[PDB]
Homo-oligomer: A and B are copies of this chain.
Amino acid sequence: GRTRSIGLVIPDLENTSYTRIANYLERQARQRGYQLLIACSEDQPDNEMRCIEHLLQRQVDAIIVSTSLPPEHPFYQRWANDPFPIVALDRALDREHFTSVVGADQDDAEMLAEELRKFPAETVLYLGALPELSVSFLREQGFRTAWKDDPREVHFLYANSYEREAAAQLFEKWLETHPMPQALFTTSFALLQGVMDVTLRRDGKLPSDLAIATFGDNELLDFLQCPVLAVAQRHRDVAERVLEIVLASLDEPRKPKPGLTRIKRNLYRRGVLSRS
């Protein structure tokens, strides 16, 4: 009854994090005799639900999804007590009913923020997005823990989306009344790209006196002239775990106990720190 196929619904194959996870999931699925069917949602809920339906129509045996919807959204509640495996990747689904393989956001932000705090800097800027979301709050809580005994006042700035242009416009507006920071903590690589876009437009280069700490990573940051700290997901491990959950959900009498499986990120020392 098994088509030996597994759906993967992710926003795109642009974002390095998503391409890397797709890369490893495809490799590992093929090694177990499964064809991955990738369907990109463009991070849009209506598209995502359409992709889900299309994959069901193609009779995939299971679906791995990074959802753009709230974790408890009714659309997925259809599968809450059903044999059909839906496994969440990166962004959680209802921990009562689904297994989600996600980051250890609070801990990872604390670990990154503790490293950032080691750089002398008068002006410290925290740039996040969508502060009301659980994920955003957890990252800020981790940062605050790391900085709780530091006497510096940190500037908090929040974009309306985790998106490069939104960050650029907000940071550019911020610079009208604040100095360039000497320490910067960004909660997504897209936010950091917007800041870097403005800094390059304004100055033609990054300051040597700027310590950058970001979620997300790109080994090309090794070539920047300022200190850069980055936290990347353990893509290979996440892929192996998700597949193992999908196959256990198919191969065993009972599904894995629902809940979050939080996988720590790696901290990478980039920019001038790669030349220490």
Contacts and interface: CB of A to CB of B under 8 A. Distances in A.
Contact of A26 (B30, B38, B275): B38
A196 B220 contact: no
B38 A275 contact: no
Contact of A14 (B19, B40, B201, B275): B19
A54 B26 contact: no
Contacts of A12: 23
Interface stretch (A87-95, A130-138, A221-229, A254-262): A221-229
A38 B25 CA distance: 11
A74 interface: no
Interface size class of A (residues with CB under 8 A): 35 or more
A35 to B, nearest CB: 6
A217 to B, nearest CB: 12
A200 interface: yes
Interface in A42-61: 42, 51, 54, 58
A216 to B, nearest CB: 11
Nearest to A60: B35
A22 interface: yes
Contacts of A27: 40, 42
A37 interface: yes
Interface string A187-227: 00000010010001100111000000000001110111100
A40 B13 contact: no
A16 B232 CA distance: 18
Interface of A: 12-14, 19-20, 22-23, 26-27, 30, 35-40, 42, 51, 54, 58, 193, 196, 200-201, 204-206, 218-220, 222-225, 272, 274-275
